[PDB]
Design a protein around this ligand. Structure first.
Ligand SMILES: CCCCCCCCCCCCCCCCCC(=O)OCC(COC(=O)CCCCCCCCCCCCCCCCC)OC(=O)CCCCCCCCCCCCCCCCC
Ligand code: HEA
Ligand code: HEA
Ligand SMILES: CCCCC/C=C\C/C=C\C/C=C\C/C=C\CCCC(=O)O[C@H](COC(=O)CCCCCCCCCCCCCCCCC)COP(=O)(O)OCCN
Ligand SMILES: CCCCC/C=C\C/C=C\C/C=C\C/C=C\CCCC(=O)O[C@H](COC(=O)CCCCCCCCCCCCCCCCC)COP(=O)(O)OCCN
Ligand SMILES: CCCCC/C=C/C/C=C\CCCCCCCC(=O)O[C@H](COC(=O)CCCCCCCCCCCCCCC)COP(=O)(O)OCC[N+](C)(C)C
Ligand SMILES: CCCCCC/C=C\CCCCCCCCCC(=O)O[C@H](COC(=O)CCCCCCCCCCCCCCC)COP(=O)(O)OC[C@@H](O)CO
Ligand SMILES: CCCCCC/C=C\CCCCCCCCCC(=O)O[C@H](COC(=O)CCCCCCCCCCCCCCC)COP(=O)(O)OC[C@@H](O)CO
Ligand SMILES: CCCCCC/C=C\CCCCCCCCCC(=O)O[C@H](COC(=O)CCCCCCCCCCCCCCC)COP(=O)(O)OC[C@@H](O)CO
Ligand SMILES: CCCCCCCCCCO[C@@H]1OC(CO)[C@@H](O[C@H]2O[C@@H](CO)[C@@H](O)[C@H](O)[C@@H]2O)[C@@H](O)[C@H]1O
Ligand SMILES: CCCCCCCCCCO[C@H]1O[C@H](CO)[C@@H](O[C@H]2O[C@@H](CO)[C@@H](O)[C@H](O)[C@@H]2O)[C@@H](O)[C@H]1O
Ligand SMILES: C[C@H](CCC(=O)O)[C@H]1CC[C@@H]2[C@H]3[C@H](O)C[C@@H]4C[C@@H](O)CC[C@]4(C)[C@@H]3C[C@@H](O)[C@@]21C
Ligand SMILES: C[C@H](CCC(=O)O)[C@H]1CC[C@H]2[C@@H]3[C@H](O)C[C@@H]4C[C@H](O)CC[C@]4(C)[C@H]3C[C@H](O)[C@]12C
Ligand code: CUA
Ligand SMILES: [Cu+2]
Ligand SMILES: [Mg+2]
Ligand code: NA
Ligand SMILES: [Zn+2]
Ligand SMILES: [Zn+2]
Ligand SMILES: [Zn+2]
Ligand SMILES: [Zn+2]
Ligand SMILES: [Zn+2]
Ligand SMILES: [Zn+2]
Lengths: 58, 43, 227, 98, 46, 259, 79, 514, 84
């Protein structure tokens, strides 16, 4: 292996006003959307589940 | 502390409205459930 | 039992509860005094135009108000401990009765000689006889010999419960798998009430305790007949 | 039994930590890491309070071992005095980032 | 950069005192109301 | 624009995704325990993994790449880890309290003896002793790794770190086998209770610590660590020691004194 | 014979509010003393003491349960 | 831009604001629950049903008031708002983790509400003692959800504790020693430490309770060698510190408020106050069994706990007198906050004295589990902690909002709440002594009088809480912006104007080492 | 203690490697040797329906609700005894 830290320091300091969690490129975006989607979706689902369990099925 | 006069003065009339609206947001939903309490226990 | 508009403690029936009462009286005096002192002083600080906002020295007066409350706590712990040691005192009982909590009633067991046992339920408000106390009556009272040192063993067969008898100064938790001892001793004959003192479910408010303190003789007859 | 291959701070430090490291090599304190030593706080020898605007908040611990700190904005211009002990403080504006 | 100053440092708007009264009303009311409807809900299962 | 050493963090979504993944996990567990369904649990775990991955990727970015970790910022991160570890300790102390309570006053249902009647302890001089040596060994190999890094020796830091990791894994495997070969189960009363829970949690931390070390390994691989600035490694090491020491307490209390 | 038992007296081996062991002890002591006498040809009249004591202290259900277990062959205590 | 600022924040001020909002909402929920309680006990007989639904209410009342109202406000709110500013820090040490501490509470709350929704709820008491809380007497998800709720609330506060300590240690001006930081900053740190130490234990305990309920462990089940009493130890080990954790930040705010409105530049006996707070925090870790006097423990043990608990009165006595000394010779400003503070000083003393009464294991036998306990804790919580939160709120409102409140309306809110809470809780001293047990949906007829008066006071307090909401709106509706604020020389938090900018102390203060 | 060796003039990387290979690892070698010796499948004891073991207050959330997580047929009996 070779030290490529300098390449990464440059990329991440590249003044494009991007927040560190997206400053890595297009991938960051994708990962974040997946994450956020899952979280919110899962959250809805859970709300669903609380609803279901709130009522008796005798 | 010192402060500048109200930018949007709330006249007594407006306040009465505020106060009332406030108490009602508390008192009504409860008053409702509390009223139909009997209708709930055995239904 | 308690009467309407009661302020203090239910009258002392045992010598131990007579002890707690006298102790609570000197303790409460201090509680009043201090709380009223603070209040007065609060008022004292707030009733003057005179001022002194520059720095005030602390190490000199902190000796005063550390040592003072200090001496006071001791004037509460001393009688508190001697009395605590008292309740533990070895005494040698004449009888031994076990009680076991159950959701939601008390079962009793007098097994020194005979194999006597019985459940004890709260008399519903609907089946109370004229003059009988709501929520406080049971069908089977705990008959016991007045003026005798008795040993009560408490436990439970389900969740936690707690056996209490205010007038005699008693409260022992009913813990499943455990056998808690506590001594009873009434200085008088009569009926003595208590209530389950540990959340135990749906009817925790409804499973009281009544004790019937009669003389030895009647106690014996009752034991026999209860067979 | 030995060798290398591990970057040093000098070679890899970047960003703000590099700046601090560099400025620290020159005996400077741009990012207020050290506690400034007090002058005699007289009219003639005031405490030189650096800054990057026309004012900065000063905290005056009048006497050593005081628990209460006196705070006030130090304005560019005439040297001001601590409302408590009266020691003098003078703002000495801008630069830092060349 | 984020808006700074009175009425700007909050997540709810204070532009219109009436829209606000409504806002606050739904907020504080929804909370106060909740236990009651839960109680209600529990009584209605059996 | 700022004249202090501290770090002003770019607004991030992770705290939320994290708080949310917590909600999904706890729910996911309730769903499983009572309404037999892992679906919720599944997602929860997945988001938790993503949150942690991204949240720490960013912290690496902010330090190795952007250089925001000034000494003041690093000093603060030290207090942070030490404090975290302390709480972790107190957590374990809970389980130790439990075990000690149960074994010092055995109840009639066990037979008023410890171990209870019907319980056949693992030999502390067999695999348990081995695990003990493995973790102690990793403590040494991780210390060699540290002193190698501080002397700028890359090859040896890697060597030492690798071994350290291999040992943690080995412990985990040994423990997995021991869990299986165990004549007692978690359902075998207070013994099986205090046992599998305590050692179960410790095992988990072993996995976490190993994971952490694994991360430090790769970051080392990519040259992120300077011979003087390597807090990520410093922490994994502190954590690892905590794990090492907890095991010492377990071995002595549950496997040795408690058999 | 040397009896005239009112109720189990104070045992210096169990002086605290928890009596669980007291009961348990005496219940074990009896059934042990009982198995020795039934075995070596002697009279169970000697184990009387423990029987009275355990009986006085132990909750019927505990006794009932421990007995059901010595029979089922699943009593955890050593007798 | 809204999301980034409010869902993705990394600003200590914003986060404290979020906490303040959560805390206020939760206060409504908890007040509602408190009324449902006093309604049931309003007149004899049953109103809602048996003890199950009743106790599901009493339990939530506690969880909400404690974990969702008092802690989030005092610590996440006044903490995140005031601490950085009081020490001239740009923000918190881990401003991002600080955001997660916040976002855990809603899910935490959500789980709590969800436990009272499913099955029959968890009518177990806030202490969640087994076996009543076990999977048999309390089968179903209910208790399991309450647990997870605690977990989330737990993780949140633990992380929160770390942040506040790191921050208060590492981020002070280079010249400022720990003995140069404001009392409220001290109190926050100490509190953060108790949290750090106590919470993991509670976590271990409730986790054992969870397994017993879903994994067949028997930590608290006698059948397997367990003991219900163990859970109690584990719980109260955390439980006592927790009460102190609920009052320390209050002590902090009180010291600032009394000093401020006394017209003093500093609180009387600073070092004494630091000593006191640290002593308390300490002793609060070795007195938990005072909550178990009736489970029947050795008399030596019960002798120790009686002794130890009583000692806490000494450091605590110091603080009270210091507060009076701060008032001593001041130019008194009879503002609202001052009124709450003066209120607090007195009332809290009372609830503490009674706390001392309960310390006697002798006397506790008869008072344990009665209403005397309820009187004691409501005097220090619903009067102590609550008064302090009020005072802090009226005082620093200008600073947080930029607007001022109508002082007279505020003095009215004080008078109402004052009468309410006393009428509510003072009579409970009688019920306690006369034997009324806790957690009862109905009671014997002799206890009728006091229970009715109590319920009435609880209504005045309701009137008061509604009014407060109104007063808040009023200040937000009128918009009287802030101009000048006195005593800024010794109240650094106010020095950046009301409200200060998003980014404060970008340029550190200047403090001479000398 | 001081152990039974010496170094200390300077505790650096070479020293710690030395310990790793000349103590730590050999320790683990012996303990592995010993372990993979005293092993061997010990005769599973006679089953006894003890009421304090094999507890079941709620079915396990996996399988048929009656087998522990790391259930080993050879040594873990069910509430009703060993399996086929
Ligand atoms: C709301 C219902 C009131 C019912 C009153 C009594 C009726 C008696 C009939 C008829 C009376 C005569 C016949 C019966 C005698 C029974 C003696 C008994 O068994 O004796 C024991 C009993 C009764 O004790 C008494 O001997 C009653 C004492 C009452 C003290 C009241 C202070 C009240 C202040 C303002 C009003 C109350 C609300 C605000 C309270 C604010 C906190 C105190 O039980 C107690 O221990 C109750 C108190 C528990 C501890 C609270 C301690 C701190 C309280 C106040 C410090 C204030 C200092 C400044 C001075 C006070 C400044 C404000
Ligand atoms: C600090 C928490 C707290 C507070 C403030 C209170 C307040 C109230 N509580 Fe209580 N209560 C508990 C914690 C608290 N309580 C706990 C732990 C228990 C025991 C639980 C158990 O046994 O399991 C208990 C038990 C309990 C009982 C005994 C139940 C029983 O034994 O059956 C009763 C009944 O009288 C009661 C009454 C009240 C009343 C009338 C109030 C009223 O005084 C409330 C009046 C309303 C307020 C004072 C709300 C103000 C705060 C806000 C709304 C924030 C506002 C917004 C901003 C300023 C930002 N509470
Ligand atoms: C705000 C939280 C809070 C605070 C700070 C306190 C403070 C104290 N509490 Fe506690 N207490 C509770 C909340 C609090 N408490 C709660 C919630 C419960 C019920 C829990 C439950 O069951 O759910 C309770 C329960 C409780 C018990 C258990 C009773 C029982 O269940 O039977 C005991 C035991 O001793 C007690 C005592 C004390 C004591 C001695 C103090 C001391 O810290 C008080 C010290 C203060 C002073 C002493 C006043 C000032 C002093 C002077 C002016 C100097 C002079 C003093 C003397 C010389 C006497 N409290
Ligand atoms: C290989 C060594 C490492 C151990 C962990 C690895 C795999 C298990 C999965 C998760 C474990 C994580 C923590 C431990 C939690 C419970 C103890 C589990 C320890 C363990 O794995 O014990 C096993 C029981 O498995 C069981 O029930 C476990 C059932 C699995 C479901 C887990 C239950 C989840 C409950 C977690 C509660 C979370 C609360 C934590 C809060 C933290 C602070 C807020 C023992 O197997 P057994 O057949 O009974 O005896 C073996 C007989 N041959
Ligand atoms: C039977 C029970 C069973 C369970 C047991 C289970 C496990 C056992 C327990 C522990 C073992 C585990 C791991 C140990 C290995 C490493 C830990 C890390 C320590 C370390 O390596 O510390 C270093 C130095 O010492 C420093 O921190 C010193 C500074 C510390 C600061 C943090 C503390 C602040 C918190 C509150 C302060 C306390 C106040 C004391 C006075 C109170 C009086 C009552 C790092 O530097 P730094 O932070 O920049 O400080 C600058 C000061 N030199
Ligand atoms: C269990 C319950 C316990 C009950 C509590 C009992 C309370 C104690 C009662 C009395 C305390 C007596 C303290 C005596 C200090 C003298 C007061 C004084 O006069 O205050 C200053 C002293 O400084 C100083 O100690 C600093 C100022 C005064 C220092 C002490 C003031 C605070 C006292 C407490 C305030 C009331 C709260 C009491 C709490 C219950 C004035 O200074 P000098 O005269 O040098 O300079 C002025 C210039 N000359 C020389 C021209 C006059
Ligand atoms: C620590 C330094 C300060 C020193 C002061 C001493 C305080 C604690 C240490 C002492 C612990 C050992 C004492 C045991 C001796 C008695 C044996 C015994 O038997 O005690 C048992 C419980 O002990 C148990 O688990 C005890 C379990 C532990 C409880 C103590 C809690 C403190 C833990 C938190 C501190 C964090 C430290 C961080 C770790 C690095 C059971 O109770 P008994 O009442 O007997 O029930 C029997 C009845 O049938 C008859 O009455
Ligand atoms: C199957 C496996 C899944 C199990 C779930 C958990 C999984 C893995 C947990 C392992 C932890 C991974 C942590 C990796 C952190 C990487 C980021 C890092 O290490 O960040 C470092 C900072 O430390 C920092 O924030 C320190 C960060 C502290 C993180 C440690 C926390 C442990 C987490 C425990 C969670 C569970 C708690 C217990 C449950 C009861 C970066 O600073 P430096 O290294 O100095 O770099 C700068 C130099 O390059 C300059 O020249
Ligand atoms: C029933 C199941 C319950 C489940 C509950 C689960 C709750 C949450 C799950 C999701 C949380 C995981 C996501 C990763 C969190 C990492 C936090 C971290 O690593 O935080 C660091 C601070 O704490 C430090 O170092 C040192 C501290 C490291 C803390 C790691 C967080 C782990 C969370 C678990 C804690 C458990 C408590 C343990 C005791 C029982 C970084 O501080 P930031 O403000 O980010 O940055 C500051 C910048 O200068 C960095 O460049
Ligand atoms: C503890 C917190 C609660 C404090 C006490 C509540 C204060 C008063 C609330 C008033 O609320 C209501 O009053 C009613 C009675 O006046 C109701 O009307 C009802 O009653 C009727 C008139 O008698 C009917 O016209 C309708 O069907 C109706 O349901 C009812 O809806 C309810 O909103
Ligand atoms: C605080 C940190 C801790 C957070 C919580 C820890 C999470 C632990 C996850 C456990 O999840 C699992 O659950 C299952 C049960 O649904 C399994 O499948 C199993 O269970 C069955 C379903 O009934 C069977 O079909 C199979 O044989 C199989 O073994 C199993 O493999 C495992 O992954
Ligand atoms: C390639 C690298 C040398 C430095 C560089 O990257 O240029 C070498 C040197 C030392 C490292 C190794 C160490 O010698 C330790 C390990 C030993 C091997 O048996 C397997 C892989 C092993 C895990 C390592 C892989 C290897 O690729 C590394 C990473
Ligand atoms: C010595 C220490 C700090 C002094 C300082 O550096 O300013 C001070 C702070 C608080 C003081 C303590 C508090 O005043 C409480 C106690 C008061 C008694 O007057 C003496 C002991 C007593 C326990 C004090 C001893 C000592 O003077 C303390 C501990
Ligand atoms: Cu029995 Cu409550
Ligand atoms: Cu306490
Ligand atoms: Mg109790
Ligand atoms: Na009622
Ligand atoms: Zn000065
Ligand atoms: Zn800026
Ligand atoms: Zn560096
Ligand atoms: Zn290092
Ligand atoms: Zn059987
Ligand atoms: Zn800015």
């Amino acid at each position: 292996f070779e030290n490529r830290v300098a390449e990464k320091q440059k990329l991440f300091q590249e003044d494009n006003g991007l927040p560190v969690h997206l400053k890595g490129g297009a991938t960051d975006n994708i990962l974040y959307r997946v994450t956020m989607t899952l979280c919110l979706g899962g959250t809805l689902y859970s709300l669903y589940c609380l609803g279901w369990a709130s009522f008796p099925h005798k | 502390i010192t402060a500048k006069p109200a930018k949007t003065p709330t006249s007594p009339k407006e306040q009465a409205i505020g106060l009332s609206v406030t108490f009602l947001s508390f008192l009504l939903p409860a008053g409702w459930v509390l009223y139909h309490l009997d209708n709930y226990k055995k239904s | 039992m308690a009467y309407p508009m009661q302020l203090g403690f239910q009258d002392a029936t045992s010598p131990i509860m007579e002890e707690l009462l006298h102790f609570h009286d000197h303790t409460l005096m201090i509680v009043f005094l201090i709380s009223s002192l603070v209040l007065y002083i609060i008022s004292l600080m707030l009733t003057t135009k005179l001022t002194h906002t520059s720095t005030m020295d602390a190490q000199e007066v902190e000796t005063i108000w550390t040592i003072l409350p200090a001496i006071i706590l001791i004037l509460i712990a001393l009688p508190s401990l001697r009395i605590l040691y008292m309740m533990d005192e070895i005494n040698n009982p004449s009888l031994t009765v076990k009680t076991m909590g159950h959701q939601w009633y008390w079962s009793y067991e007098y097994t020194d000689y005979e194999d006597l046992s019985f459940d004890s339920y709260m008399i519903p408000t609907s089946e109370l006889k004229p003059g009988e106390l709501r929520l406080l009556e049971v069908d089977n009272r705990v008959v016991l010999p007045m003026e005798m040192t008795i040993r009560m063993l408490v436990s439970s067969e389900d969740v936690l419960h707690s056996w209490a008898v205010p007038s005699l100064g008693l409260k022992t938790d009913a813990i499943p798998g455990r056998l808690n001892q506590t001594t009873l001793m009434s200085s008088r004959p009569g009926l003595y009430y208590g209530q389950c003192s540990e959340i135990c479910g749906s009817n925790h408010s409804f499973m009281p305790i009544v004790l019937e303190l009669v003389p030895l003789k009647y106690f014996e007859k009752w034991s026999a007949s209860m067979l | 039994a030995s060798g290398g291959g591990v970057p040093t701070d000098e070679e890899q430090a970047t960003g703000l930590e590099r700046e601090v490291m560099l400025a620290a090599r020159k005996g400077q304190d741009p990012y207020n890491i050290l506690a400034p030593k007090a002058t005699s706080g007289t009219k003639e020898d005031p405490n030189l309070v650096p800054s990057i605007t026309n004012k900065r908040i000063v905290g005056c611990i009048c006497e050593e071992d005081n628990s209460t700190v006196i705070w006030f904005w130090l304005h560019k211009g005439e040297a001001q005095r601590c409302p408590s002990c009266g020691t003098h403080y003078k703002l000495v504006p801008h630069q830092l980032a060349h | 950069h984020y808006e700074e100053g009175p009425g700007k440092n909050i997540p709810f708007s204070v532009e219109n005192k009436w829209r606000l009264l409504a806002m606050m009303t739904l907020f504080f009311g929804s909370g106060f109301a909740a236990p009651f409807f839960i109680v209600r809900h529990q009584l209605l299962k059996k | 624009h700022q004249t202090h050493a501290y770090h002003m963090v770019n607004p991030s979504p992770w705290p939320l995704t994290g708080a949310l993944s917590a909600l999904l996990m706890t729910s996911g567990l309730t769903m499983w325990f009572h309404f037999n369904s892992m679906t919720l649990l599944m997602i929860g775990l997945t988001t938790n993994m993503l949150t942690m991955y991204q949240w720490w990727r960013d912290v690496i970015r902010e330090s190795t790449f952007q250089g925001h970790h000034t000494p003041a910022v690093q000093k603060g991160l030290r207090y942070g880890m030490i404090l975290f570890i302390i709480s972790e300790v107190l957590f374990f102390t809970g389980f130790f309290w439990a075990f000690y309570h149960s074994s010092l006053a055995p109840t009639p249902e066990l037979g008023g003896c410890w171990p209870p009647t019907g319980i056949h302890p693992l030999n502390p001089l067999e695999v348990p002793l081995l695990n003990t040596s493995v973790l102690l060994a990793s403590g040494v190999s991780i210390t060699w790794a540290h002193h190698s890094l501080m002397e700028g020796d890359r090859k040896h830091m890697l060597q030492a770190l690798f071994i350290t990791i291999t040992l943690g894994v080995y412990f985990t495997l040994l423990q997995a086998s021991e869990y299986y070969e165990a004549p007692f189960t978690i359902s075998d009363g207070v013994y099986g209770s205090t046992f599998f829970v305590a050692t179960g949690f410790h095992g988990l931390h072993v996995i976490i610590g190993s994971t952490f070390l694994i991360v430090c390994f790769f970051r080392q691989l990519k040259f992120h660590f300077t011979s003087n600035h390597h807090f990520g490694f410093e922490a994994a090491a502190w954590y690892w020691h905590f794990v090492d020491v907890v095991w010492l307490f377990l071995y002595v209390s549950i496997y040795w004194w408690g058999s | 014979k040397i009896k005239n038992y009112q109720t189990a007296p104070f045992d210096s081996r169990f002086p605290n509010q928890n009596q669980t062991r007291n009961c348990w002890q005496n219940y074990l002591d009896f059934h042990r003393c009982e198995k020795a006498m039934t075995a070596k040809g002697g009279d169970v009249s000697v184990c009387e003491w423990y029987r009275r004591v355990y009986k006085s202290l132990c909750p019927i259900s505990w006794v009932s349960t421990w007995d059901d277990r010595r029979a089922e062959g699943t009593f955890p205590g050593k007798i | 831009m809204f999301i980034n600022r409010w869902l993705f924040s990394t600003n200590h001020k914003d986060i404290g604001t979020l906490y303040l909002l959560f805390g206020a909402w939760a206060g409504m929920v908890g007040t509602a629950l408190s009324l449902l309680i006093r309604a049931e006990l309003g007149q004899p007989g049953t109103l809602l049903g048996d003890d199950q639904i009743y106790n599901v209410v009493v339990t939530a009342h506690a969880f909400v008031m404690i974990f969702f109202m008092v802690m989030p406000i005092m610590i996440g709110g006044f903490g995140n708002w005031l601490v950085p500013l009081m020490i001239g820090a740009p923000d918190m040490a881990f401003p991002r983790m600080n955001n997660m501490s916040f976002w855990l509470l809603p899910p935490s709350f959500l789980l709590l509400l969800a436990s009272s929704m499913v099955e029959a709820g968890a009518g177990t008491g806030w202490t969640v003692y087994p076996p009543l809380a076990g999977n048999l007497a309390h089968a179903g998800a209910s208790v399991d959800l309450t647990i997870f709720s605690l977990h989330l609330a737990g993780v949140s506060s633990i992380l929160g504790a770390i942040n506040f300590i790191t921050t208060i240690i590492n981020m002070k001006p280079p010249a400022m020693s720990q003995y140069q930081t404001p009392l409220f900053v001290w109190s926050v740190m100490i509190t953060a430490v108790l949290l750090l130490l106590s919470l993991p234990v509670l976590a271990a305990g409730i986790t054992m309770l969870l397994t017993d309920r879903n994994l067949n462990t028997t930590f608290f089940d006698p059948a397997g060698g367990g003991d219900p009493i163990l859970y109690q130890h584990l719980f109260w080990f955390f439980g006592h510190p927790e009460v102190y954790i609920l009052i320390l930040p209050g002590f902090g705010m009180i010291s600032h408020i009394v000093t401020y409105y006394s017209g003093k530049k500093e609180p009387f006996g600073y070092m004494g106050m630091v000593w006191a707070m640290m002593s308390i925090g300490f002793l609060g870790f070795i007195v938990w069994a005072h909550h178990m006097f009736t489970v029947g423990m050795d008399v030596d043990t019960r002798a120790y706990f009686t002794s130890a608990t009583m000692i806490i009165a000494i450091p605590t006595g110091v603080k009270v007198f210091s507060w009076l000394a701060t008032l001593h010779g001041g130019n008194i400003k009879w503002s609202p906050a001052m009124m709450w503070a003066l209120g607090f000083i007195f009332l809290f003393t009372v609830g503490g004295l009674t706390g001392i009464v309960l310390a006697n294991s002798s006397l506790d036998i008869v008072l344990h589990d009665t209403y005397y306990v309820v009187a004691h804790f409501h005097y220090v919580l619903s009067m102590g902690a609550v008064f302090a939160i009020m005072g802090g709120f009226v005082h620093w409102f200008p600073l947080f909002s930029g607007y001022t409140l109508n002082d007279t309306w505020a003095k009215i809110h004080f008078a109402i709440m004052f009468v309410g809470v006393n009428m509510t809780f003072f009579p409970q001293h009688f019920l306690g002594l006369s034997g009324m047990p806790r957690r009862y949906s109905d009671y014997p007829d002799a206890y009728t009088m006091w229970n009715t008066i109590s319920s009435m006071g609880s209504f005045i307090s309701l009137t008061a809480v509604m009014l407060m909401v109104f007063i808040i709106w009023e200040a937000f509706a009128s918009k009287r912006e802030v101009l000048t604020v006195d005593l800024t020389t010794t109240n650094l938090e106010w020095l950046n104007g009301c409200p200060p900018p998003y980014h404060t102390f970008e340029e550190p203060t200047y403090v001479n080492l000398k | 203690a001081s152990a039974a060796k010496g170094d200390h003039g300077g505790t650096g990387a070479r020293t710690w490697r030395f310990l790793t290979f000349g103590l730590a690892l050999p320790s683990v070698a012996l303990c592995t040797l010993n372990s993979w010796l005293h092993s061997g499948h010990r005769e599973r004891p006679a089953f006894i329906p003890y009421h304090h073991l094999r507890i079941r207050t709620k079915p396990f959330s996996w399988g048929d609700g009656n087998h522990t997580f790391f259930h080993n047929p050879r040594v873990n009996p069910l509430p009703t005894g060993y399996e086929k």
